[PDB]
Amino acid sequence: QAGIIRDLLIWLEGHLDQPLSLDNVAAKAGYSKWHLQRMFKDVTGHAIGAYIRARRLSKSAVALRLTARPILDIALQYRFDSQQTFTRAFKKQFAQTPALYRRSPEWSAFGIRPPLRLGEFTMPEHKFVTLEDTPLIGVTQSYSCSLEQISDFRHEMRYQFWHDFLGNAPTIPPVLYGLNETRPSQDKDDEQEVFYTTALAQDQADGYVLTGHPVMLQGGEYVMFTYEGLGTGVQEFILTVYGTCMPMLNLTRRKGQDIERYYPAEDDRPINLRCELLIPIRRKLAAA
Amino acid sequence: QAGIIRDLLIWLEGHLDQPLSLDNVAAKAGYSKWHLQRMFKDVTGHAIGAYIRARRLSKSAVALRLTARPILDIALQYRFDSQQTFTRAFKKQFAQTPALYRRSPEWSAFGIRPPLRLGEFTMPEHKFVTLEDTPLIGVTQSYSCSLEQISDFRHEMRYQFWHDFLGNAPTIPPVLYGLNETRPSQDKDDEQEVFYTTALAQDQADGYVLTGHPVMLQGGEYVMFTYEGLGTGVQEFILTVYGTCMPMLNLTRRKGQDIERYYPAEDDRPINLRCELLIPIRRKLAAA
DNA sequence: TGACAGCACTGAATGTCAAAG
DNA sequence: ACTTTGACATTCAGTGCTGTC
């Protein structure tokens, strides 16, 4: 039945990561290696083996754009044999090498295999907006972490800036910005840097940001996803935005910065918070 | 009822040959696949799919030893897709490759799966005998046919010899000999020639004028099976001797020649003939 | 008839020894 | 020496048919 694959998928997704698993290991679901395959193929219309391989290579496309980790660390984490096995496989799915997949100014979901929803999926709310150059003031640091740690690392960088700011400020700014940017390495182009900028509107922060500098929030077209929930749901919010909404919208991310907007001045059970993820986009022209 | 499978087994055994059949074609005897099986199973105590499979490789084995046809033929005639199909399976049941199986000097019923006997199977009469070398004058030729055609081909060979021989003979020989012998090829040892020798022994009637050369009837130990009945049953006889008697007695055939003995001097409804088949054997020594 | 274990043939991927370039 | 290339053994995914309960 579908209630079996329903729970199986919740497991896989959360374990493509560390734990190893092939049709045999996946049998640790209670059934025989074969009945399972036919069952999985009935309920989802997909062959279990080729899906797992595609979810892993999908996480891999995201980890290559969002993190600074070296191509090997990323492949090893997702149970791949070696860089070579990884590469070959990767080329088949995205018709390109991981190195060129990362260096690429633009990004599309051409070969992304989003996770599978077996029934009720509520896609984060989204809207298309145009932003105008917004003068900001902030601190920007290069960071390195796994796809699974992004939310935590960013929360730490934001925490420092914010509490340091409120220590010397008579007024509370309405918004806290978190700008993510990627920079291709000029040596071997398999490497790239990732920076996070915690900033405030120039009007707001005024001369209260210790070690702050001028930052120009770039204007242009963006898609804006909104999130409202426990701060602990933020990690899941970002990955589904990159792992399932961008692809589903068949959109192209332009070179630029990702913009997270927080409204801290609005958050003793875990606190509920709201924030918006803004992705720099290039919409396609529909053909008559 | 046990009578239902009784009739099918007979049909099976006489069609493992050309006609194809599986749990679907086999269900073309009335009941549906699922039910038929449980019947054929709760009775015989064997899976009709595995059975039909085992009977074929069994006949594959016999043909590989008694005929000169190329492996691919044997494999096909018994409804097998390719030679590899046949080969894998053959190894499954016999633990040897067909090629080596044929080449082998000695032979045993290791993997031969004899046809099940529901009703009352009257196994042929046997006796272990020891023969002395004997000179015979005869004729021999390399023949080549299928398992189901042996008795006929041989019969025609004795006929020429016999009637050609009688034309000049003042007295009738009391015994006509038929010696089957195999000879490994020298190129691809997946092939082999088969020779039949029709010959006569010195009797108490002075002379004879026969074409041919001196042939040695090799001495040694043999198992003798005797048959009485229509010359049309001779084919059945040979097969049940090779396909079920050799196996049950768990006997081993030594390199050498098979020996048929006919008493045609005593044979207008289909007349009843009498003959003995002698196979070269080497009995096992038991263990204290 | 149905839920489910296990085998058989195909095929893509990877690994191996080696004549070939 | 050193990577390229093809016959061939081994592996495991994938879809189907056999087979027990």
mmCIF file of N, CA and C in Angstrom, chain A residues 163-270:
data_model
loop_
_atom_site.group_PDB
_atom_site.id
_atom_site.type_symbol
_atom_site.label_atom_id
_atom_site.label_comp_id
_atom_site.label_asym_id
_atom_site.label_seq_id
_atom_site.Cartn_x
_atom_site.Cartn_y
_atom_site.Cartn_z
ATOM 1 N N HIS A 163 22.849 41.386 18.344
ATOM 2 C CA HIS A 163 23.001 41.764 19.729
ATOM 3 C C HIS A 163 24.049 42.809 19.942
ATOM 4 N N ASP A 164 25.052 42.834 19.077
ATOM 5 C CA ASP A 164 26.067 43.848 19.188
ATOM 6 C C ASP A 164 25.426 45.161 18.809
ATOM 7 N N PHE A 165 24.571 45.145 17.792
ATOM 8 C CA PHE A 165 23.916 46.372 17.361
ATOM 9 C C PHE A 165 22.994 46.965 18.423
ATOM 10 N N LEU A 166 22.158 46.120 19.017
ATOM 11 C CA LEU A 166 21.228 46.584 20.026
ATOM 12 C C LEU A 166 21.913 47.056 21.316
ATOM 13 N N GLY A 167 23.223 46.853 21.411
ATOM 14 C CA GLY A 167 23.915 47.289 22.601
ATOM 15 C C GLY A 167 24.202 48.777 22.564
ATOM 16 N N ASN A 168 24.346 49.331 21.363
ATOM 17 C CA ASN A 168 24.651 50.751 21.220
ATOM 18 C C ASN A 168 23.587 51.551 20.496
ATOM 19 N N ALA A 169 22.419 50.965 20.266
ATOM 20 C CA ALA A 169 21.393 51.653 19.493
ATOM 21 C C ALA A 169 20.120 52.005 20.219
ATOM 22 N N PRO A 170 19.759 53.286 20.155
ATOM 23 C CA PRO A 170 18.585 53.910 20.753
ATOM 24 C C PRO A 170 17.280 53.557 20.029
ATOM 25 N N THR A 171 17.401 53.108 18.781
ATOM 26 C CA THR A 171 16.240 52.763 17.956
ATOM 27 C C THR A 171 16.342 51.375 17.381
ATOM 28 N N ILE A 172 15.210 50.698 17.228
ATOM 29 C CA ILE A 172 15.215 49.339 16.684
ATOM 30 C C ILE A 172 14.835 49.263 15.183
ATOM 31 N N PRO A 173 15.751 48.783 14.323
ATOM 32 C CA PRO A 173 15.453 48.679 12.891
ATOM 33 C C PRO A 173 14.366 47.623 12.660
ATOM 34 N N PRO A 174 13.515 47.829 11.644
ATOM 35 C CA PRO A 174 12.408 46.944 11.270
ATOM 36 C C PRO A 174 12.817 45.654 10.621
ATOM 37 N N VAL A 175 13.978 45.640 9.982
ATOM 38 C CA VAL A 175 14.408 44.460 9.248
ATOM 39 C C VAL A 175 15.874 44.124 9.436
ATOM 40 N N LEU A 176 16.209 42.840 9.350
ATOM 41 C CA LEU A 176 17.601 42.405 9.471
ATOM 42 C C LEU A 176 17.854 41.668 8.172
ATOM 43 N N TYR A 177 18.894 42.047 7.444
ATOM 44 C CA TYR A 177 19.163 41.363 6.192
ATOM 45 C C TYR A 177 20.283 40.368 6.317
ATOM 46 N N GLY A 178 20.168 39.285 5.556
ATOM 47 C CA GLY A 178 21.186 38.251 5.513
ATOM 48 C C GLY A 178 21.413 37.976 4.039
ATOM 49 N N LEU A 179 22.528 38.462 3.501
ATOM 50 C CA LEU A 179 22.850 38.316 2.092
ATOM 51 C C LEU A 179 23.838 37.212 1.840
ATOM 52 N N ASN A 180 23.493 36.256 0.985
ATOM 53 C CA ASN A 180 24.412 35.158 0.700
ATOM 54 C C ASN A 180 24.962 35.388 -0.692
ATOM 55 N N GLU A 181 26.259 35.183 -0.860
ATOM 56 C CA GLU A 181 26.897 35.400 -2.149
ATOM 57 C C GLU A 181 27.945 34.348 -2.408
ATOM 58 N N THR A 182 28.186 34.055 -3.686
ATOM 59 C CA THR A 182 29.189 33.064 -4.052
ATOM 60 C C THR A 182 30.217 33.693 -4.962
ATOM 61 N N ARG A 183 31.464 33.287 -4.772
ATOM 62 C CA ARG A 183 32.573 33.790 -5.558
ATOM 63 C C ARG A 183 33.419 32.630 -6.033
ATOM 64 N N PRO A 184 33.521 32.475 -7.354
ATOM 65 C CA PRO A 184 34.293 31.415 -8.007
ATOM 66 C C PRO A 184 35.773 31.609 -7.738
ATOM 67 N N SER A 185 36.481 30.533 -7.415
ATOM 68 C CA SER A 185 37.914 30.626 -7.158
ATOM 69 C C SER A 185 38.664 30.736 -8.485
ATOM 70 N N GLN A 186 39.649 31.633 -8.538
ATOM 71 C CA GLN A 186 40.436 31.862 -9.747
ATOM 72 C C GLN A 186 41.534 30.834 -10.025
ATOM 73 N N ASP A 187 41.804 29.945 -9.073
ATOM 74 C CA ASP A 187 42.817 28.913 -9.280
ATOM 75 C C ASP A 187 42.160 27.777 -10.053
ATOM 76 N N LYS A 188 41.898 26.661 -9.377
ATOM 77 C CA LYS A 188 41.234 25.531 -10.021
ATOM 78 C C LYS A 188 39.760 25.865 -9.872
ATOM 79 N N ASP A 189 39.007 25.900 -10.973
ATOM 80 C CA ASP A 189 37.604 26.255 -10.831
ATOM 81 C C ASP A 189 36.648 25.128 -10.486
ATOM 82 N N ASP A 190 36.937 24.489 -9.361
ATOM 83 C CA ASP A 190 36.120 23.423 -8.813
ATOM 84 C C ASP A 190 35.794 23.981 -7.431
ATOM 85 N N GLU A 191 36.548 25.009 -7.050
ATOM 86 C CA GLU A 191 36.375 25.653 -5.752
ATOM 87 C C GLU A 191 35.670 27.004 -5.874
ATOM 88 N N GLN A 192 35.030 27.416 -4.780
ATOM 89 C CA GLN A 192 34.326 28.692 -4.734
ATOM 90 C C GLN A 192 34.207 29.145 -3.276
ATOM 91 N N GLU A 193 34.015 30.444 -3.080
ATOM 92 C CA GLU A 193 33.869 30.980 -1.731
ATOM 93 C C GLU A 193 32.405 31.333 -1.522
ATOM 94 N N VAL A 194 31.986 31.322 -0.261
ATOM 95 C CA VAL A 194 30.610 31.637 0.091
ATOM 96 C C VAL A 194 30.649 32.655 1.207
ATOM 97 N N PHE A 195 29.938 33.756 1.031
ATOM 98 C CA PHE A 195 29.940 34.777 2.052
ATOM 99 C C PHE A 195 28.550 35.082 2.556
ATOM 100 N N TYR A 196 28.462 35.470 3.825
ATOM 101 C CA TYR A 196 27.191 35.860 4.403
ATOM 102 C C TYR A 196 27.402 37.292 4.870
ATOM 103 N N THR A 197 26.456 38.168 4.572
ATOM 104 C CA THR A 197 26.558 39.553 4.998
ATOM 105 C C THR A 197 25.370 39.839 5.887
ATOM 106 N N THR A 198 25.627 40.270 7.115
ATOM 107 C CA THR A 198 24.515 40.609 7.982
ATOM 108 C C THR A 198 24.503 42.111 7.913
ATOM 109 N N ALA A 199 23.373 42.686 7.539
ATOM 110 C CA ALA A 199 23.315 44.124 7.377
ATOM 111 C C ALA A 199 22.007 44.754 7.807
ATOM 112 N N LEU A 200 21.996 46.076 7.752
ATOM 113 C CA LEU A 200 20.864 46.887 8.151
ATOM 114 C C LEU A 200 20.731 47.972 7.120
ATOM 115 N N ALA A 201 19.600 48.661 7.127
ATOM 116 C CA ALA A 201 19.419 49.761 6.195
ATOM 117 C C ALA A 201 20.370 50.843 6.701
ATOM 118 N N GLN A 202 20.981 51.586 5.790
ATOM 119 C CA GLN A 202 21.911 52.633 6.181
ATOM 120 C C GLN A 202 21.242 53.659 7.106
ATOM 121 N N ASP A 203 19.979 53.951 6.836
ATOM 122 C CA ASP A 203 19.249 54.890 7.671
ATOM 123 C C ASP A 203 19.280 54.360 9.103
ATOM 124 N N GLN A 204 18.795 53.131 9.271
ATOM 125 C CA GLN A 204 18.716 52.463 10.571
ATOM 126 C C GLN A 204 20.027 52.380 11.349
ATOM 127 N N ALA A 205 20.817 51.359 11.047
ATOM 128 C CA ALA A 205 22.085 51.142 11.730
ATOM 129 C C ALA A 205 22.851 52.418 12.048
ATOM 130 N N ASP A 206 22.754 53.418 11.180
ATOM 131 C CA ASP A 206 23.462 54.665 11.428
ATOM 132 C C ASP A 206 24.916 54.305 11.757
ATOM 133 N N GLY A 207 25.555 55.098 12.616
ATOM 134 C CA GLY A 207 26.937 54.822 12.980
ATOM 135 C C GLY A 207 27.048 53.931 14.206
ATOM 136 N N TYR A 208 26.227 52.891 14.253
ATOM 137 C CA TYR A 208 26.215 51.974 15.378
ATOM 138 C C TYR A 208 26.784 50.595 15.066
ATOM 139 N N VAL A 209 27.071 50.331 13.799
ATOM 140 C CA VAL A 209 27.604 49.026 13.467
ATOM 141 C C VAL A 209 29.111 49.015 13.589
ATOM 142 N N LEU A 210 29.593 48.307 14.608
ATOM 143 C CA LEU A 210 31.023 48.173 14.847
ATOM 144 C C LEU A 210 31.586 47.421 13.648
ATOM 145 N N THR A 211 32.703 47.893 13.106
ATOM 146 C CA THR A 211 33.336 47.245 11.956
ATOM 147 C C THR A 211 32.393 47.045 10.763
ATOM 148 N N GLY A 212 31.402 47.915 10.633
ATOM 149 C CA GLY A 212 30.490 47.774 9.519
ATOM 150 C C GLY A 212 31.029 48.472 8.289
ATOM 151 N N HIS A 213 30.453 48.168 7.135
ATOM 152 C CA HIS A 213 30.864 48.810 5.896
ATOM 153 C C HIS A 213 29.658 48.961 4.968
ATOM 154 N N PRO A 214 29.780 49.801 3.936
ATOM 155 C CA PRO A 214 28.686 50.018 2.993
ATOM 156 C C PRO A 214 28.445 48.797 2.122
ATOM 157 N N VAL A 215 27.187 48.403 2.022
ATOM 158 C CA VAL A 215 26.793 47.249 1.226
ATOM 159 C C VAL A 215 25.614 47.654 0.367
ATOM 160 N N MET A 216 25.664 47.362 -0.923
ATOM 161 C CA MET A 216 24.551 47.718 -1.797
ATOM 162 C C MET A 216 23.693 46.498 -2.133
ATOM 163 N N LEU A 217 22.496 46.451 -1.563
ATOM 164 C CA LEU A 217 21.567 45.377 -1.840
ATOM 165 C C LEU A 217 21.148 45.617 -3.306
ATOM 166 N N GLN A 218 21.575 44.728 -4.200
ATOM 167 C CA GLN A 218 21.303 44.852 -5.638
ATOM 168 C C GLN A 218 19.839 44.770 -6.076
ATOM 169 N N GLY A 219 19.420 45.730 -6.896
ATOM 170 C CA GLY A 219 18.054 45.735 -7.398
ATOM 171 C C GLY A 219 17.845 44.759 -8.555
ATOM 172 N N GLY A 220 16.588 44.460 -8.866
ATOM 173 C CA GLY A 220 16.295 43.536 -9.942
ATOM 174 C C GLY A 220 15.071 42.673 -9.671
ATOM 175 N N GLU A 221 14.895 41.615 -10.463
ATOM 176 C CA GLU A 221 13.744 40.740 -10.298
ATOM 177 C C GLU A 221 14.037 39.575 -9.379
ATOM 178 N N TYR A 222 13.107 39.310 -8.477
ATOM 179 C CA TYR A 222 13.281 38.241 -7.514
ATOM 180 C C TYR A 222 12.002 37.486 -7.298
ATOM 181 N N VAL A 223 12.155 36.266 -6.785
ATOM 182 C CA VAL A 223 11.040 35.433 -6.364
ATOM 183 C C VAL A 223 11.147 35.554 -4.826
ATOM 184 N N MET A 224 10.025 35.724 -4.141
ATOM 185 C CA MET A 224 10.050 35.828 -2.694
ATOM 186 C C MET A 224 9.213 34.758 -2.021
ATOM 187 N N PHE A 225 9.889 33.854 -1.331
ATOM 188 C CA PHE A 225 9.216 32.812 -0.588
ATOM 189 C C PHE A 225 9.064 33.341 0.834
ATOM 190 N N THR A 226 7.960 33.010 1.493
ATOM 191 C CA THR A 226 7.788 33.480 2.853
ATOM 192 C C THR A 226 7.723 32.286 3.772
ATOM 193 N N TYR A 227 8.180 32.475 4.992
ATOM 194 C CA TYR A 227 8.160 31.411 5.965
ATOM 195 C C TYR A 227 7.650 32.009 7.261
ATOM 196 N N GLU A 228 6.793 31.247 7.932
ATOM 197 C CA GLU A 228 6.218 31.647 9.205
ATOM 198 C C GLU A 228 6.170 30.352 9.974
ATOM 199 N N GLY A 229 6.927 30.286 11.064
ATOM 200 C CA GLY A 229 6.972 29.075 11.858
ATOM 201 C C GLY A 229 8.056 29.146 12.907
ATOM 202 N N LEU A 230 8.308 28.020 13.555
ATOM 203 C CA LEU A 230 9.329 27.972 14.580
ATOM 204 C C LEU A 230 10.654 28.252 13.893
ATOM 205 N N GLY A 231 11.546 28.948 14.587
ATOM 206 C CA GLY A 231 12.846 29.237 14.009
ATOM 207 C C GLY A 231 13.565 27.951 13.644
ATOM 208 N N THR A 232 13.165 26.865 14.296
ATOM 209 C CA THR A 232 13.741 25.545 14.057
ATOM 210 C C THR A 232 13.263 24.925 12.742
ATOM 211 N N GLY A 233 12.298 25.567 12.092
ATOM 212 C CA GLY A 233 11.803 25.066 10.823
ATOM 213 C C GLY A 233 12.474 25.750 9.647
ATOM 214 N N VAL A 234 13.315 26.732 9.945
ATOM 215 C CA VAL A 234 13.999 27.489 8.915
ATOM 216 C C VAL A 234 14.918 26.671 8.012
ATOM 217 N N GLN A 235 15.637 25.701 8.570
ATOM 218 C CA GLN A 235 16.537 24.853 7.777
ATOM 219 C C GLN A 235 15.733 24.122 6.721
ATOM 220 N N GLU A 236 14.623 23.537 7.153
ATOM 221 C CA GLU A 236 13.759 22.817 6.239
ATOM 222 C C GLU A 236 13.157 23.772 5.206
ATOM 223 N N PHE A 237 12.955 25.029 5.594
ATOM 224 C CA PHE A 237 12.381 26.028 4.694
ATOM 225 C C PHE A 237 13.273 26.365 3.514
ATOM 226 N N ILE A 238 14.563 26.537 3.788
ATOM 227 C CA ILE A 238 15.530 26.867 2.750
ATOM 228 C C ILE A 238 15.737 25.719 1.764
ATOM 229 N N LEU A 239 16.052 24.537 2.272
ATOM 230 C CA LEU A 239 16.268 23.408 1.377
ATOM 231 C C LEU A 239 15.075 23.115 0.482
ATOM 232 N N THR A 240 13.851 23.213 0.988
ATOM 233 C CA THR A 240 12.724 22.926 0.112
ATOM 234 C C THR A 240 12.568 24.030 -0.926
ATOM 235 N N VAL A 241 13.089 25.216 -0.621
ATOM 236 C CA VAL A 241 13.012 26.328 -1.550
ATOM 237 C C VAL A 241 13.959 26.057 -2.686
ATOM 238 N N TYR A 242 15.132 25.552 -2.344
ATOM 239 C CA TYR A 242 16.142 25.248 -3.342
ATOM 240 C C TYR A 242 15.955 23.848 -3.925
ATOM 241 N N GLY A 243 15.516 22.925 -3.077
ATOM 242 C CA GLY A 243 15.336 21.553 -3.486
ATOM 243 C C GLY A 243 14.043 21.229 -4.186
ATOM 244 N N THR A 244 13.000 22.023 -3.974
ATOM 245 C CA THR A 244 11.751 21.704 -4.638
ATOM 246 C C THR A 244 10.943 22.854 -5.266
ATOM 247 N N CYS A 245 11.039 24.065 -4.742
ATOM 248 C CA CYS A 245 10.273 25.156 -5.347
ATOM 249 C C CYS A 245 10.895 25.736 -6.616
ATOM 250 N N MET A 246 12.200 25.999 -6.581
ATOM 251 C CA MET A 246 12.893 26.562 -7.737
ATOM 252 C C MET A 246 12.703 25.664 -8.930
ATOM 253 N N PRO A 247 12.934 24.361 -8.752
ATOM 254 C CA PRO A 247 12.757 23.452 -9.882
ATOM 255 C C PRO A 247 11.307 23.471 -10.350
ATOM 256 N N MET A 248 10.393 23.209 -9.422
ATOM 257 C CA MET A 248 8.978 23.186 -9.745
ATOM 258 C C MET A 248 8.514 24.422 -10.521
ATOM 259 N N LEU A 249 9.174 25.559 -10.323
ATOM 260 C CA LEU A 249 8.786 26.784 -11.028
ATOM 261 C C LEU A 249 9.567 26.957 -12.318
ATOM 262 N N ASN A 250 10.448 26.004 -12.604
ATOM 263 C CA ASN A 250 11.280 26.042 -13.801
ATOM 264 C C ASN A 250 11.825 27.454 -13.972
ATOM 265 N N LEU A 251 12.526 27.917 -12.943
ATOM 266 C CA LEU A 251 13.101 29.252 -12.937
ATOM 267 C C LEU A 251 14.611 29.204 -13.038
ATOM 268 N N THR A 252 15.197 30.332 -13.421
ATOM 269 C CA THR A 252 16.640 30.470 -13.537
ATOM 270 C C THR A 252 17.160 31.552 -12.586
ATOM 271 N N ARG A 253 18.044 31.142 -11.677
ATOM 272 C CA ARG A 253 18.648 32.064 -10.738
ATOM 273 C C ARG A 253 19.749 32.844 -11.463
ATOM 274 N N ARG A 254 19.734 34.173 -11.359
ATOM 275 C CA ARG A 254 20.756 35.001 -12.008
ATOM 276 C C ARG A 254 21.921 35.206 -11.055
ATOM 277 N N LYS A 255 23.048 35.663 -11.586
ATOM 278 C CA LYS A 255 24.199 35.929 -10.744
ATOM 279 C C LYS A 255 23.772 37.066 -9.837
ATOM 280 N N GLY A 256 24.058 36.930 -8.544
ATOM 281 C CA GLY A 256 23.684 37.966 -7.603
ATOM 282 C C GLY A 256 23.656 37.442 -6.187
ATOM 283 N N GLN A 257 22.839 38.056 -5.342
ATOM 284 C CA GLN A 257 22.780 37.622 -3.958
ATOM 285 C C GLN A 257 21.415 37.135 -3.482
ATOM 286 N N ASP A 258 21.425 36.144 -2.583
ATOM 287 C CA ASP A 258 20.196 35.625 -1.997
ATOM 288 C C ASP A 258 19.867 36.540 -0.830
ATOM 289 N N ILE A 259 18.615 36.937 -0.706
ATOM 290 C CA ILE A 259 18.291 37.842 0.356
ATOM 291 C C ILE A 259 17.300 37.320 1.370
ATOM 292 N N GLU A 260 17.792 37.186 2.603
ATOM 293 C CA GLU A 260 16.966 36.753 3.706
ATOM 294 C C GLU A 260 16.606 38.047 4.461
ATOM 295 N N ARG A 261 15.324 38.224 4.748
ATOM 296 C CA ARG A 261 14.865 39.370 5.510
ATOM 297 C C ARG A 261 14.281 38.843 6.817
ATOM 298 N N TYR A 262 14.792 39.334 7.939
ATOM 299 C CA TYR A 262 14.248 38.915 9.212
ATOM 300 C C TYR A 262 13.632 40.136 9.868
ATOM 301 N N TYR A 263 12.708 39.886 10.783
ATOM 302 C CA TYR A 263 12.026 40.955 11.499
ATOM 303 C C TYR A 263 12.084 40.551 12.957
ATOM 304 N N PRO A 264 13.284 40.579 13.543
ATOM 305 C CA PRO A 264 13.478 40.200 14.942
ATOM 306 C C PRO A 264 12.651 41.016 15.914
ATOM 307 N N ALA A 265 12.565 42.316 15.683
ATOM 308 C CA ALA A 265 11.784 43.168 16.557
ATOM 309 C C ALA A 265 10.330 42.694 16.641
ATOM 310 N N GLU A 266 10.066 41.441 16.255
ATOM 311 C CA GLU A 266 8.711 40.883 16.296
ATOM 312 C C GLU A 266 8.606 39.439 16.804
ATOM 313 N N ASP A 267 9.651 38.905 17.436
ATOM 314 C CA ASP A 267 9.598 37.528 17.938
ATOM 315 C C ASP A 267 9.462 37.469 19.458
ATOM 316 N N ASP A 268 7.603 30.861 27.348
ATOM 317 C CA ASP A 268 8.791 31.211 26.516
ATOM 318 C C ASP A 268 9.103 30.081 25.526
ATOM 319 N N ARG A 269 8.071 29.315 25.159
ATOM 320 C CA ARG A 269 8.222 28.210 24.209
ATOM 321 C C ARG A 269 9.052 28.681 23.014
ATOM 322 N N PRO A 270 9.591 27.743 22.210
ATOM 323 C CA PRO A 270 10.384 28.206 21.064
ATOM 324 C C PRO A 270 9.604 29.297 20.336
#
